[PDB]
Design a protein around this ligand. Structure first.
Ligand SMILES: Nc1ncnc2c1ncn2[C@@H]1O[C@H](COP(=O)(O)NP(=O)(O)O)[C@@H](O)[C@H]1O
Ligand SMILES: Nc1ncnc2c1ncn2[C@@H]1O[C@H](COP(=O)(O)NP(=O)(O)O)[C@@H](O)[C@H]1O
Ligand SMILES: [Cl-]
Ligand SMILES: [Cl-]
Ligand SMILES: [Cl-]
Ligand SMILES: [Cl-]
Ligand SMILES: [Mg+2]
Lengths: 356, 356
């Protein structure tokens, strides 16, 4: 396919492992990629930021990730995300010095850039990947599309907003796609992703099903409004999510919301009932509260012994609600679309659109 | 030494690696260990909770940790701490099933117990290890000794307090050491340890030296009282540290405080000036504020290019203060002793005292 079309590789170096995507694409007369197709996809574990940063360890890791690919001589972007953002810069630099050397030693891959992207650039790529899949990029807008990424270490939110000199430059992006200028607000809250935030609530009985054993030896005694309130303290008293986001959304309303990341896995599970790949915050909290928070744990576990996230769904349903409703200000009745997990939508498509 | 005295092994399976300690000891006429001496000490990396939990990976890890030890046939305790507490129980159980099998396959080591200890038991062992080293356990008290452990994922606080039926049983321990009954309040805040809490503040410019590059691309603009206020929101609005701890300390004052864990490394560094292995919260914050928070980063880095924690000392000095003063209620002028890092005091001594 790379003889008939252009090709580009994007490595998503995320917190649990690194995923190489190779895409073929064509370019239309606005200089924008079209017909983007993933032609190779390889994941390896563990996360890059968890491995020893010396040449032997990096060489083994990059060789396992890359050496099997069926194409010589294509541009590659190596983009690490929140996993790496959590490491000191001095530690990060040891990985990049070794990685820069490794790429210089070979010619199959033409490294364009290797860096830890900001959460705001990740949010940009999220918005582009979603809108590409929905086919909303090509014609002149008319409805505002917002995207939320519920990631493992950081969460992103991104939505159209005219340029504003009162708002930091880091929270705004300007781009032109399919011939149209776009202005977006982007924000990422590092620490607020579902794995990192969970580490603050593991001994909260409000956040777990009844009788679930907490690490400190106490028992869950779930209640989603209570758990939601505890999560909302982290969101608003610490991260100031409400103060930062709600006034901007009031002034630049979003007509349609799409979410990606873990909410898609919860909402697609056997325990929750959602159709048309959408949910409302009201339904999500009511179903978490009734089905997990106030449910006897051993009984529930006996019934769904294979979903290893089951025991976490009182906390996650409470947290998604606390983030969207108490943090972002979204009405509990507002439809939120989620991208099905079995659709393999990936933010790296955004990198192809913006950088290829 | 194990022919002339009793011996016991304690494995501290912590978040960055596992450390085996083998101790020799004698027992006095109160049935309490005395003359406790570490005779072998082996550390391996990475943390147990980060390795693949299958037999090959666990066998390699345990063999590297244990197989070199110069003693056959002694009791061993395998105690994991907050690293493992952060994993779901179902994940933990995969490690323990493999570990139980591994010990059953050999006879050099007589596994007594392998488990993830609660933060409250860790606090008990902290208090015993410190007071053992200070030689305060042997005679009838008279001054109240409190211990704080500033650990990487959880923090512990522990101090004498008469039994109280209004307080949860999990937060109280009764023991008899050197013939005397002891009642202690123990508390552990999981998520509040310095590595986990830092992941909530990495994009806070108040928490870093001026011009230090934050992951989101903004620049540090340090101010310790500001950074302290942000940390205090996590401590009090989320973890309710003040509400839980201050009323109990008001009613059961501590005459002498000892801290262990990372505060010892900061306070022993080239940048801070502390003598007699003690500090006050007032001095700690004033020195962080002047020397790191409001200091130009590149200049400071040029001067101390070898302390890889240097860039974190505005945040850590602010956080220790927020925890002790705003959380626990300690007067900013009160002396806090810290156990020098070069003294190799280890909480596993507490396990010998309590369980050998
Ligand atoms: N059932 C679930 N509920 C909520 N979040 C869920 C979930 N299953 C996965 N996740 C979240 O999605 C992330 C990505 O899940 P996957 O990509 O499905 N698993 P892997 O690539 O790590 O093998 C997980 O790290 C977790 O944050
Ligand atoms: N200079 C420092 N300032 C504040 N905390 C410091 C520090 N140096 C280490 N630490 C803290 O102590 C912990 C234990 O440090 P060490 O035992 O000295 N290093 P290692 O055993 O991981 O090789 C670290 O994980 C970190 O939390
Ligand atoms: Cl605990
Ligand atoms: Cl329901
Ligand atoms: Cl960021
Ligand atoms: Cl000073
Ligand atoms: Mg972690």
């Amino acid at each position: 396919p790379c003889e008939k079309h252009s090709c580009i590789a994007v490595i998503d170096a995320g917190s649990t492992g690194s995923r190489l995507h190779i895409y073929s694409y064509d370019t239309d007369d606005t200089n924008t990629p079209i017909h983007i197709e993933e032609i190779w996809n390889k994941k390896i574990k563990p996360g890059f930021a968890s491995i020893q940063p010396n040449s032997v360890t990096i060489d083994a890791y990059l060789t396992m990730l890359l050496a099997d690919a069926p194409i010589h001589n294509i541009p590659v972007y190596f983009y690490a995300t929140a996993g790496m953002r959590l490491l000191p810069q001095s530690q990060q630099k040891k990985y990049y010095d070794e990685l820069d050397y490794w790429f210089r030693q070979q010619s199959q891959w033409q490294l364009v850039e290797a860096k830890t992207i900001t959460g705001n650039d990740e949010a940009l790529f999220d918005w582009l990947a979603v809108n590409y899949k929905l086919d909303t990029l090509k014609s002149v807008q008319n409805k505002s599309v917002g995207v939320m990424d519920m990631g493992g270490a950081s969460v992103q939110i991104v939505f159209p907003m005219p340029k504003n000199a009162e708002i930091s430059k880091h929270n705004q992006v300007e781009l032109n796609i399919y011939g149209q200028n776009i202005n977006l607000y982007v924000h990422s809250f590092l620490g607020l992703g579902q794995t990192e935030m969970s580490h603050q609530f593991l001994n909260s009985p409000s956040c777990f099903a009844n009788d679930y054993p907490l690490p400190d030896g106490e028992s869950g005694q779930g209640n989603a409004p209570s758990c939601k309130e505890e999560v909302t303290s982290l969101m608003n008293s610490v991260h100031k999510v409400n103060q930062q986001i709600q006034p901007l959304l009031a002034l630049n309303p979003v007509n349609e919301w799409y979410s990606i990341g873990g909410i898609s896995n919860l909402a697609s599970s056997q325990l929750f009932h959602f159709e048309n790949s959408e949910l409302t915050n009201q339904s999500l909290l009511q179903q978490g509260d009734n089905q997990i928070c106030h449910q006897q744990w051993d009984i529930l576990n006996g019934q769904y012994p294979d979903d290893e996230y089951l025991y976490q769904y009182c906390l996650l349903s409470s947290y998604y609600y606390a983030l969207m409703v108490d943090g972002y200000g979204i009405n509990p009745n507002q439809t939120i679309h989620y991208i099905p997990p079995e659709q393999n939508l990936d933010w790296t498509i955004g990198v192809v659109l913006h950088r290829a």
